[PDB]
Amino acid sequence: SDPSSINGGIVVAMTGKDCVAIACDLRLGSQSLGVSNKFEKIFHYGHVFLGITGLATDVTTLNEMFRYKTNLYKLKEERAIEPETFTQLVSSSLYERRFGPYFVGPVVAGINSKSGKPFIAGFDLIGCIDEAKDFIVSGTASDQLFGMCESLYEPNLEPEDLFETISQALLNAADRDALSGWGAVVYIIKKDEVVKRYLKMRQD
Amino acid sequence: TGYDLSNSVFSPDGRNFQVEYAVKAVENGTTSIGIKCNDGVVFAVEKLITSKLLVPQKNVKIQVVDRHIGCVYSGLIPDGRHLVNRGREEAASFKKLYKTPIPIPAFADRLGQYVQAHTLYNSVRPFGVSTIFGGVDKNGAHLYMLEPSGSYWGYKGAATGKGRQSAKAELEKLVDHHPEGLSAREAVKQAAKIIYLAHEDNKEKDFELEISWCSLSETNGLHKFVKGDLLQEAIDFAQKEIN
Amino acid sequence: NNYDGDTVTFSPTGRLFQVEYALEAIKQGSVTVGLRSNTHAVLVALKRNADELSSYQKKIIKCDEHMGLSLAGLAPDARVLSNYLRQQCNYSSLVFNRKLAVERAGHLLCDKAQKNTQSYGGRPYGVGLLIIGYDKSGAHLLEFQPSGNVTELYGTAIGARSQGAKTYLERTLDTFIKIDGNPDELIKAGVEAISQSLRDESLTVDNLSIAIVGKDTPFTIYDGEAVAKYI
Amino acid sequence: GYDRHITIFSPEGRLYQVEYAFKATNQTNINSLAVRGKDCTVVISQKKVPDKLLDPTTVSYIFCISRTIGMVVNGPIPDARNAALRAKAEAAEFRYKYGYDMPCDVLAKRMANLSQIYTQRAYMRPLGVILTFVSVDEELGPSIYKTDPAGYYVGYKATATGPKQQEITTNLENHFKKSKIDHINEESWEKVVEFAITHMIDALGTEFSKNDLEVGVATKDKFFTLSAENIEERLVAIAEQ
Amino acid sequence: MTDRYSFSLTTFSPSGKLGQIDYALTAVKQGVTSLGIKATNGVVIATEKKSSSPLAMSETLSKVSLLTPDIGAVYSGMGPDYRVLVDKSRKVAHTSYKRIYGEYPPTKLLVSEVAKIMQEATQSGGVRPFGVSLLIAGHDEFNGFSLYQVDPSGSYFPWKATAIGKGSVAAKTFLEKRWNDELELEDAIHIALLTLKESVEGEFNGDTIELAIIGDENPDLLGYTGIPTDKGPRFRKLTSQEINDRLEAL
Amino acid sequence: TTIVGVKFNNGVVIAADTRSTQGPIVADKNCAKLHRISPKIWCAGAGTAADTEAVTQLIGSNIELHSLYTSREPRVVSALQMLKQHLFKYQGHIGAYLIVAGVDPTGSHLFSIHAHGSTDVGYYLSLGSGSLAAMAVLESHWKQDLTKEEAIKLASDAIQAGIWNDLGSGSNVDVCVMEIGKDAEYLRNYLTPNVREEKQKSYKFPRGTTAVLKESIVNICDIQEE
Amino acid sequence: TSIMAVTFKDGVILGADSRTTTGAYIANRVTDKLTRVHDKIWCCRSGSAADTQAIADIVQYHLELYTSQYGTPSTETAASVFKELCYENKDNLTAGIIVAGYDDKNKGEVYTIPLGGSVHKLPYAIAGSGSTFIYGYCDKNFRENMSKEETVDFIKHSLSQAIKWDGSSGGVIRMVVLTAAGVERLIFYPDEYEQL
Amino acid sequence: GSRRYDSRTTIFSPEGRLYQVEYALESISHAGTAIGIMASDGIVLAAERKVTSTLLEQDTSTEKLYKLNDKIAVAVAGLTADAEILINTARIHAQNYLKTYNEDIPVEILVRRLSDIKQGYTQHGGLRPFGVSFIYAGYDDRYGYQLYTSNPSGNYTGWKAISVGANTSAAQTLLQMDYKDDMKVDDAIELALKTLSKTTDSSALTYDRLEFATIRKGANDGEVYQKIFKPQEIKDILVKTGIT
Ligand SMILES: *[B]([O])([O])[C]([C][C]([C])[C])[N]C(=O)[C]([C]C1=[C][C]=[C][C]=[C]1)[N]C(=O)C1=[C]N=[C][C]=N1
Ligand SMILES: *[B]([O])([O])[C]([C][C]([C])[C])[N]C(=O)[C]([C]C1=[C][C]=[C][C]=[C]1)[N]C(=O)C1=[C]N=[C][C]=N1
Ligand SMILES: [Cl-]
Ligand SMILES: [Cl-]
Ligand SMILES: [Mg+2]
Ligand SMILES: [Mg+2]
Ligand SMILES: [Mg+2]
Ligand SMILES: [Mg+2]
């Protein structure tokens, strides 16, 4: 009944020293029934990364929408969109459906190509921007993720250390949520290289 | 040239020839007048008897708007009816929102703006009538005359149609000889005379006289037609003056 | 000349040529006569045929139990206007339980025709109408012109050669007005009136069309052998 | 030659319908003048009642647009009243939407934009009027802003409009060359009206009775027109010195 | 009523010419001279305040207009057309960009939107083209400083320096000799004043000349403090006094 | 949420806490509730966060266009009128509860706005879940003819009362001062009385602690030449 | 809310408390419920604050536009504009408004417009939640053609009692006097009216 | 009424021609020449800017060559403002297709859509047609490298080598002479520039008077790269081919 918890899933993002990390689980289900273990929730438009939790049809629809808009942006602007600008575009796009909203929890992550500054942001389903310094959480295990992040996180972590922190935050949060898990992906993002890692986790 | 072929086009003079051509239709029409009196107004019109087959006192020309405004016009009769229909809508919406009956100056502008709007586009034709109208409101008696251009002013006496010059001359005498004012019953008598005197311009066919009036004392500020004995009294007075 | 291309254009002398051209279509139409007394009102119409194989075009249309008209000019325009009258008569009955006054019916036709003479794109109606009726103020006869001008009359005629019938009625004015409580004699006067507009052709059984309305007489149309009595 | 019938460009880059609308402006044969005082803005205009049958009280080309804004028109009365009604509606709407009284210059711009649209859109004709707006603005003080059929508008130290505008304009120009200030240095509005009438008399070379003039005065928080008796008092003061 | 002009008033003639656009350009030719020069660290735009009357207060009429905090515009041709275009240009900068991306548009894209509006008046029903040519100077983070011309057709071109209106042919020749890629903003202002003096007949001073720049950020003109990333508008209109100071070193 | 507005001698000050919540969870610890409508017109927002942001941006955008159209600095009553009519039209469904303040050519002003579109005038105002705690402080310590220094102190104290006593409010105090004839100063994190203590332990993991299945480079660059 | 308007010899006086409540919390203790729609046409507002403000703002706009075209409107005209808004939007509005004004021709007039959007011209009118507690008092103590001082005392005593018994009413007693002389604002504080 | 001033932009002549389309083509014949040449391993787009100035900022300028998506580009001949209206519509159409089918739009489908829009203005609406002719250069996995052209009539055709704008008669004769089917991109680049150099109304062909672009599979492995040439890069290729 509750659109935000039919399919399940989670996304978490973290900042480090000259780097950002964004991670998600791979589950898509129909309430109790597990359907797919390959449903990735993180997408990217140029160097800007977008994770989306919530209703899976809206996750797909919004990805297609932001691909659409970022492609037109690039043709007209003659440059890739930046995380700060994309964050505003997500907010604008969500608020135009104020009284008929997409049932999603988006999370933006990336590094500004000009300033080199790490950037993360979270949103509610109607467009409100949460621009945190430390971390952003989203999905059916958001309580769990808040608890993990708030204890495990420390500032200025190196890329390879940040990977361990965000991975443990996701895994242990997912294992306390029935509608999350079934695999996980972690993106480590630096100014001009991005590494993608699939995590080994319990499959129940 | 070609400036006169389309409405709302300025000629090199700065003139709208289509409106000036509408005036020619007004000048071709029968004579109609208005007289402002002490506590009201009087309207009168010339009705040409084209044939014996016309039923007397049936083809009424003067029209009422709301219950306190009288309207008469010269030129294209249907255009005048269209304008009065609009006037009635304007008066109804005013009374609907503001409760009080529409003041005469307020009513005058409603017609004025509507007629003026028909000089703004080539997709419409100007009105082929000059309308004399007025009545009694909270501030007293008012008489107006409205032209095809949308131009209107307040008047002490007004006249239009084929016998307007003759009528205007007669109205000017009344203004000079009665600075303190004219009574309602006097104005009806004078109105009858002026129409009869103005009939010399349409002397081929005989005519029928039609008079109406609004007066604070005589009609309680409501528009009424002059009928029966009071009408005959005015006709007798008029017939006596021409002889 | 240069000012007759559309209805939205006055001429330099203040004339509307498209309206005048519409008026011309009536003069080409077949003659029809209207007259009334105090009790009854009568329409008489000379129907026109295309040829000997063709039927005679109907001229008279019923609008209500107490009202109807005869046409001269473009017949389809008479159908549009008569349909409008039917609706207006019908609105008066359904909403106010009130038979529509003949004078008010004329006012409604005037205003409908007027809108077509002041707006761009449209055209004036190309037909003249003679409306008869019996309402709360007795018998009535109206003449409609597509300029918008509607006139209440004792008697009249419109169409080709209508001047002859109109003169006759102007002489007979004092006689036929007094024909009260006698429908047949009032029709006789109407048939004799329309006869003054005839040349070459005469009134035959399928040529003549008569209608009547009165005090205790609903609007009824007579055609065929029903009018042989009056020939 | 249909480029002279509607508002499209001629080969010279001109809009003839706009130019002919400017010529309609002088059809009334009336001259108007506007000047600024310290605390006030005064506008005067010739009043001509040729017909004896006219009610002279109703013959006017000055309009009370809002409590603060007044407007005098040069041009035919139908177009004048069209512009007046619109300005009143715009001024009222502005107050409702934005919570404060519409400034004189802002109304002038709005009406000028509407006029511009008629010069660009074919189905709408220009209005054959010049609109002179006057007020004492709460920010800018005494204000005179004038609009024309081209959609042009600008603020003024003083201005004149009509058939004999140039004679009045030069007369005013020469005064401000002497005083070297942007206004009439005078405390009371009564004396500013006297200045306005005096300089119109000198420029036109005609004397005025009480019924030959029409006067509008803008002060802080209200605009008002003078009666025939108020003008008479003004004419007496001029004659006595 | 109804707008029954649903057809184009600008059409191709047998020779392939769009008459109304050509005639609009002729109206621009009659217009007062305006110019723009681009420097390394700024842009300057300038024009003559041709006062219609000495009684008229020429300060109230603004020929040079702020569109965004970092973009300005000047014109040659019909003033009223320019005024409404500025209103539409300011609005479209918000509706089609700022309300979407949370930031002001880059110069080229705002120019593109203005160009679109002018193109539509060349093709849409019942309208004539705008009788103006615009010069739009602006700055943005990724493109730096830029200067654009926009014509009645809707066509726009980027310029290092240019002039439009009355004496544009002579003014463009004058700019070709003086312009180089190492000009500082003050040097461009100096050249702008020299170029503009040639086309002006009468008085030449701060009160008869209108001049604005796109240059350094002006935190003093921002109106508030407390946000480091907001450093103020790059658009600044030069005062009457500031112009006269540079006319002494002329 | 605790937001307040306090008038003083030569202007007006507004303040706000920085906590955003979704149910019993804190969504953002350092949320920015002071919004700029125009350079010298600022407003604090309570209720639905997206709504307070959106309605402020929209009116702020139209206020800017209005300022350019009229060649005048914007007025607080204009922002007030545009906000109330927008909110009234949406019949309270746009959940924005605002304290609108500013200085303009008319003077200094302070208003409140509720979601259904009703406005109120006052020398001191408070909105949000912590408004009762804040209003208790304002009603106890407010006086006429406050100085700039006293008004900031009173405003921040009112927010603190919300921070400590209302569970819907917390973290930091944001302030904006708008004085007549001066630039408005936005004091982001004016007070910071809720810094988290040092943790007992570092939870930095040894590298290789997490089990990995696959690795790959992600192509973020465009299609390449040659 | 406790509001009233009372006609008297020299004109009319409007009166109101200053309390706005959200349930039992007093959201505003110094509210001004006496609002101006024209120079000498004012109204007392009760019910929804948002609704009555929106209505009053629209009426002020209508009367400002009326004045520009037709000159000063009558109090009856102002009441009719209120009625039109209240009647036609009755399903969506909660507004109890008393309209009071001073003409020179008609002198002091009072029109009350309850929830349904009906209009009632009365010598005096009372409305709002607190009015219930003073129907007895006001009916017994009202006289026609009172003096200014008597009318002020009548309103002060009436609203004092309404405030005393109604939880939704309180604060200061505001009053607006409408006469030929002009417009006068009066205020009365708790210490004054409670001891009555 | 308004009928008086209607030019009637969508009617036939007695000969069965569309007046406005024909006159729009006459306009385009005065525009700067644009050439497209399709090779086995890529496509070339070359175009001449019209009588430029030394004070024109070239490196930020774009009047001829526009990008529709990553796979498709166009060369413009005619009114630039008209072209940009259509270009933005085409960009949107490509994105609509990508959103719907999750695949890049086939070149012909994009071309047909734009060509249909142009057709509409010749048959209904009473508006003037777009005074624009396009050369479409694009790639998809069905037909590979493709060249198309469209004109104000809304008619489109496929080409191996084609020119639009000024001196197309002379240009097409030269292309028809030297073009061969087994030709490569580097050779096509040379042919395009040589053809412009002979047909140009200017005294000499220089880097500042040109816009140039290629669509190559010359991208790292199975994919397509669009290269819009910079002023310095156009200057280098002019020296390489031996024109300057
Ligand atoms: B405060 O409590 O009024 C605060 C002020 C806001 C402008 C930052 N509001 C909130 O924190 C609201 C509470 C709320 C929850 C649910 C529905 C409506 C209101 N929170 C949010 O708007 C919110 C919650 N989670 C994410 C983003 N925004
Ligand atoms: B009064 O109590 O009717 C009062 C009059 C209002 C115009 C200021 N109304 C209110 O206080 C209403 C609630 C109410 C109470 C009693 C009867 C009817 C209605 N309050 C509000 O409208 C309100 C409260 N808080 C914020 C915004 N609006
Ligand atoms: Cl506008
Ligand atoms: Cl209230
Ligand atoms: Mg699990
Ligand atoms: Mg399981
Ligand atoms: Mg026009
Ligand atoms: Mg109480």
The dihedral built from the CA positions of residue B148, B149, B150 and B155, taken in this order, carries a sign that is: negative
- Cβ neighbours, 10 Å, residue B176: 9
- For chain H, how many structural domains are there in total? 1
Domain count, chain C: 1
Could you say which of B3, B9, B153 has the minimum Cβ distance to residue D58?
Answer: B153
- Cα of G167 vs centre of ligand 8, distance in Å, is 4
Dihedral sign computed on CA atoms, order F68, F69, F74, F80:
negative
Does the annotation mark F1 as catalytic? yes
Q: Would you please indicate which residues of B are annotated as catalytic (active-site) residues? A: 30
Q: Domain coordinates of chain E in residue numbers?
A: 1-250
- How is chain A split into domains, by residue range? 1-204
DSSP string, chain C: --S-SSTT---TTS--HHHHHHHHHHHHSPPEEEEE-SSEEEEEEE--BSSSSSPBPP-EEEEETTEEEEEEE-HHHHHHHHHHHHHHHHHHHHHHS-PPPHHHHHHHHHHHHHHHHHBSS-----EEEEEEEEETTEEEEEEE-TTS-EEEBSEEEESTTHHHHHHHHHHHHHHHTT--S-HHHHHHHHHHHHGGG--S----TTTEEEEEEETTEEEEEE-GGGGGGG-
CATH of domain B1-243: 3.60.20.10
- For domain A1-204, the CATH architecture is 4-Layer Sandwich (3.60)
Element (H, E) at A66: helix A56-77
Give DSSP secondary structure letters for F156-181.
Answer: HHHHHHHHHH-TT--S-EEEEEEETT
Q: Which residue type occupies C154?
A: Y
User: Contact at 8 Å (CB) between H105 and H93?
Assistant: yes
Q: Chain B contacts of G62, Cβ < 8 Å?
A: 97
Distance (angstroms) between ligand 2 centre and the Cα of F115 equals: 14
Residue owning the nearest CA to atom 2 of ligand 2: G1
- Compute the distance between CA of residue D66 and CA of residue D132 in angstroms, rounded to an integer: 14
- Separation CA B145–CA B132 (nearest Å): 4
Ligand 2 within 6 A of CB of G174: no
3-class SS of residue F60: helix
Residues, chain D: 241
CA distance G91 to chain F (A): 13
SS3 F88: helix
Residue nearest to atom 16 of ligand 1 (CA): F22
- F90-113 as b/e: b if 16+ CB within 10 A: beeebbbbbbbbbbbeeebbbbbb
Integer Cα distance of C23 and C27 in angstroms: 7
Residue A14 to chain E, least CA–CA distance (Å) = 23
Q: Any idea which residue has 């489908």 for tokens?
A: H109
Chain E residue with minimal CA distance to F54? E99
- How many Cβ atoms from other residues are within 10 Å of residue H174's Cβ? 20
Instruction: Using CB atoms, list chains with 3+ pairs below 8 Å to chain H.
Output: A, B, C, D, E, F
Written as one string, the DSSP assignment of A112-178 is -TTT--EEEEEE-TT--EE--SSEEEEETTHHHHHHHHHHH--SS--HHHHHHHHHHHHHHHHTT-T
> Helix (H, G, I), strand (E, B), or coil: what is residue F29?
coil
Q: D203 Cβ partners below 8 Å, 6+ apart?
A: D164, D167, D168, D170, D171, D172
Is C37 in contact with C181 (CB distance < 8 Å)? no
Segments forming the whole domain that contains residue G75: 1-196
DSSP H stretches of helix in B124-227: 164-177, 184-198
Q: Is the domain covering F1-226 a CATH 2.40.50.1070 domain? A: no
**DSSP secondary structure letters along D144-181:** EEEE-TTS-EEEESEEEESTTHHHHHHHHHHHHHHH-S
In the three-class reduction of DSSP (H, G, I as helix; E, B as strand; rest coil), residue A192 is classed as coil
G21 lines ligand 2 (CB under 6 A): yes
The encoded tokens of residue F19 equal 């906590």
| CATH top-level class of D1-241 | alpha beta
Q: DSSP string covering C35-77, please?
A: EE-SSEEEEEEE--BSSSSSPBPP-EEEEETTEEEEEEE-HHH
CB B237 within 8 A of CB B192: yes
CB-based burial label for H102 (10 Å; 0-12, 13-18, 19+): exposed
**What's the CA gap between B158 and B155, in Å, rounded?**
6
**Range of C133's domain?**
1-231
**Which residues of chain D neighbour F72 with C-beta distances below 8 Å?**
103, 139
Structure tokens at H210: 């040109």
Number of structural domains chain G divides into: 1
Nearest to F151 by CA among F4, F3, F2: F4
Tell me, in Å, the resolution of the deposited structure: 2.3
Q: What are the strands of the beta sheet with H132-140, ordered from one edge? A: H65-67, H72-78, H132-140, H144-150, H156-159
Report the structure determination method: X-ray
| Domain extent listing, chain D | 1-241
CATH number of E1-250: 3.60.20.10
- Three-state DSSP string of chain G: CCEEEEEECCEEEEEECCCEEECCEEEECCCCCEEEEECCEEEEEEECHHHHHHHHHHHHHHHHHHHHHHCCCCHHHHHHHHHHHHHHCCCCCCEEEEEEEECCCCCEEEEEECCCCCCEEECEEEECHHHHHHHHHHHHHCCCCCCHHHHHHHHHHHHHHHHHHCCCCCCCEEEEEEECCCEEEEEECHHHHCCC
Smallest CA–CA separation between C120 and chain H, in Å?
6
What is the best residue among F14, F18, F21 to mutate for testing ligand 1's pocket, by most ligand atoms within 8 Å of CB?
Answer: F21
With a 6 Å cutoff on the Cβ, whether F162 touches ligand 1 is no
Chains G and E touch (3+ CB pairs under 8 A): no
How far apart (Å, rounded) are the C-alpha atoms in residues D25 and D79? 10
